[PDB]
């Protein structure tokens, strides 16, 4: 029974446990393709912000969308103020912008699984994408809720990690993240976690029979982990701290020992920290490695899109002073 | 015979080592229930202070024993004290109280394992459980004792980490904890020990066997630890050094750099150091961070109570500047 | 798939993974003979430049062919000038040399992938090796790449980490370095690598069916690193840092704390950080250490020439102040 | 060839990566006897000074010969001196003393593997073992070493980590010790060892067959890990390091920020570092605490000798501010 769970116990992968073995490839990172289609939502690079009120309220939303992205307006915030920030970027040269068919950049939100009301308001706002948005989207009554699904346009629920909280959300986009974060403490504080390649792996496996969208939430430190991410069944990141302490992100200007920072911290005993991290000045640039990175990578592994990426990426395990790192 | 050893020696496991992976979930942390049965014993958290000179006398069991706890009065003392410190605590709005048949306060005694008078008045002191209490319960004097059970109301007997140690002890409780200590030297200093998870998940496949509970000895350092403590098969877990530091611990007032600390110190060449940590003031608080971390791990994998948390719990194998982690 | 990429992973080695296990030996050190045969070019101790703008121009090349080694001259530099640094190494007692059949310290260059003009001039300024240099010479055009060795005297190749890489570069000398340089961040950029002794390994078990040389390129921090290089099958070693902050090594004057230091960078977003290492004074030193230690490696492992050391060397795998640790 | 090295490289095991597992015990460390009999040589502790000109000349021997253990007078000496060190220590209430049949304290004497006339004038001195002491005893010219068994009284080899070194000297006394040195650098300059419990176990398998003793040279950095090295096969520990210091120590008082040290140094490019280590007073104490431990650990084992001690301990593998740890 309990020397079971441990005899028998799988061992599990994070970023820092692989690495990607470089393919024969035809491509060359100018010709790379990082589109991803969540569900009809079309993103013209595979990045997500993360719905912290530390990292998307309007400006970002409106910044990642014009370069391709998806920002996840955040609900620690009034409904009323919710659906106006979701309408100022429907009412905002931008050449790889993600768009509704209405040419307006799209957008998504942040809905509890009780929260009913602001479920409703949200479609009316014409919110693309709503995000049932919660710490185990696997609890039973989440799951049933079905209802969010009657009341619609897309739904992406999260975060899970799990073979079996996959096939239950059957029900637009899953998101898995239980434990990944940098500032959640979910491993510490309960004992619980999935070390997030497995996760996105096992959910995949599950999703892809059903040509369902992950996004994989949590724990990206660097663009390798990214391309690790894909290479796993990523359909994109969902990046927050990484993208934290830009001019866009709503975190609060901070100094320490003179320099520039803006907070960030955790949603909700807590799961998650109160921090600061270095002021990055404006999201693009911080976009523009990241995808720089995933196209270096992506012509490594001979990938011209992010398809070919999944179906190619093999992975292999692992066990002087510094002036320009950039 | 040497190689044989090293070839053939099995891999152990501590909390750093696992996560528990979260199921599909009925419950929530508020429908919990923490209590746990130590052989009639009816505790309402699962939660033993560690009997030591630095952690545990009158204050703590009140304390502990209010919370629903089971606090350990030790035995670096005279049984003229030992007594009048157990019917302190028969002698002291609480809901949550862990209480013997006569209302009181239930409590325990350390006593060690040649020493009959201590034993005695113990009983006479009318003391809920003894523990008796050494370094290692599995030397074979110690098993004989037998004369303590004779003697008997509940015999707690330890420290033991094997199959074996606990066939030996057939015989009302059983703790595990050689090695684990925080403070304890005992891999160091003599070479010995069993990594906390395979050390109580094999000695309560033994225990279950004949309904003879596990206490967890030593290691604790987060909530997340006690989860998976009790997810391998450990039935309280006890805590000592997480208690240190607290107004209720009888260790020492000190001061390093303008902080307050108190000390705390091993047992027992020595297999125990001397060392402070900081004041925590009242252990309640310690107490409903822990518990409150083991009720949302028990949220995580779908346990209502403590048997669920031992049937379900599944683990797997693994390998920005902070202002406020509260 | 996804899941089967994390199952069925493989398990690659760096230096810092392996030891080696001392044979029976005949032989001891000053009976070693440490020369390698790069397809016909003879070196007398298996070490080459590494082609950087901070490790290789004139000074290195005529330096270390004098010492048995081979320098590639870089290729941040105008045809006009390299060929120049070329015959000015033609155009340079040395009991250990490496010379080309007209007696002339002999010299190799560096040339990209798609740079055939430069490839010319370099044949008729008499180099005895081309290296078609590059970050993925495994890219199907690099490959395509036979137009070099159409035009030509001997042809490496360089960078693959891969069986398959080697197969298409038919096809005179391969280079392996995808991940392993100090300076390097291929690792962290584009998530992409393989631990060099697993790569030089595989890459070697092709190459050696065709009596291919390996030069094994990036990470050797250690003499002993050298020993595990060649033990895994490289025919020398391609240094760099090690030599770089030498005398002859083109990095630029530095100071920091008052002591004396010299730049070293990367040559191409970027996949190679700015930096700089101690000053170390003249070459020489510091590949006698090297050697040295090859040698006494060399005979624990009872090799008396590096093709028994490829034939005995097996590995095993692993898991007080100083003040004069020379 | 080169994969099949890596791919089926078996994996070694050093101190930090086992632990010791509690058996049933009849035995109080009290009760323990830690006596061994190294090739009629009868020691009352299992402890030899490592033959180093900072660790071992007359002062140690004397006072380690009268604790029950054996000084090596080291070789980094002349002839005429170290006879003279041999018949100071035959020419020195002492209960627990070594002593050969004439009531003398035994000792030993470090000759090298080629030096014939040193060796003479030793048996003449009346020493009582002569260890032929090099890096690498599997040197076949060594081995030849005979010549040595012929000149003879006991006969000591080292150092050697291998089964197949074990059986070419056949063969009186064999010591383990390639790599384990804390101011050894044999790994990081020649990148040869062996973890040394795998190295003692795999030598004793061969040794034990024949009843040829192990001494296990080297890494012993605490008490459990002399309990390990006997566990897996070693007969005493040859120690050096935790001996340096001590005033007993022939090392040269030495300060830094106000604090007694002593030097620490190598024998012999070098394979070995200088530095210092903490003034420790008296010897004595600190080898009275390494056996204490070993008795707590073989009390802990049920091993009432070390013969038990081998036959019983079993291994599992394994992956506050602090005031007075003594």
């Given at each position: ?53 530390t ?128 500032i ?57 701290s990484?993208?934290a302490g830009?001019?866009?992100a709503?975190g609060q200007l901070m100094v320490i020992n003179?320099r520039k920072y803006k907070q960030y911290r ?7 920290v109160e921090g600061a991290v270095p002021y990055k ?46």
């Amino acid at each position: 029974m309990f020397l079971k769970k441990l005899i028998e116990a799988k061992k599990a992968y994070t970023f820092d446990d692989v690495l990607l073995v470089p393919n024969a490839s035809w491509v060359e990172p100018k010709d790379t393709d990082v589109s991803t289609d969540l569900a009809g939502l079309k993103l013209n690079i595979p990045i997500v912000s993360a719905a912290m009120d530390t990292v998307t309220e309007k400006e970002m939303a409106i910044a990642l969308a014009r370069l391709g992205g998806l920002g996840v307006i955040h609900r620690n915030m009034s409904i009323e103020e919710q659906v106006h920030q979701v309408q100022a970027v429907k009412k905002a040269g931008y050449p790889q912008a993600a768009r509704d068919k209405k040419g307006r950049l799209l957008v998504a939100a942040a809905c509890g699984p009780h929260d009913f009301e602001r479920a409703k308001a949200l479609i009316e706002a014409e919110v693309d994408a709503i995000a049932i948005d919660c710490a185990h989207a696997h609890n039973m009554r989440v799951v049933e809720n079905k209802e969010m699904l009657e009341g619609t346009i897309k739904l992406i629920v999260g975060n899970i990690a799990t073979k079996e909280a996959a096939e239950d959300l059957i029900k637009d986009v899953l998101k898995v993240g239980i434990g990944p974060g940098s500032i959640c403490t979910t491993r510490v504080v309960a004992g619980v976690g999935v070390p997030q390649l497995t996760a996105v792996a096992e959910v995949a496996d599950v999703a892809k029979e059903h040509n369902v969208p992950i996004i994989a939430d949590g724990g990206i430190r660097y663009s390798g982990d990214i391309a690790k991410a894909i290479a796993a069944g990523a359909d994109a990141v969902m990046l927050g701290s990484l993208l934290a302490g830009t001019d866009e992100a709503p975190g609060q200007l901070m100094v320490i020992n003179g320099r520039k920072y803006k907070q960030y911290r955790g949603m909700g005993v807590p799961e998650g920290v109160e921090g600061a991290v270095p002021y990055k000045g404006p999201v693009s640039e911080v976009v523009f490695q990241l995808i720089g990175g995933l196209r270096a990578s992506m012509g490594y592994c001979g990938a011209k899109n992010l398809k070919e990426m999944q179906e190619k990426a093999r992975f292999v395990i692992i066990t002087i002073i510094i002036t320009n790192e950039a």
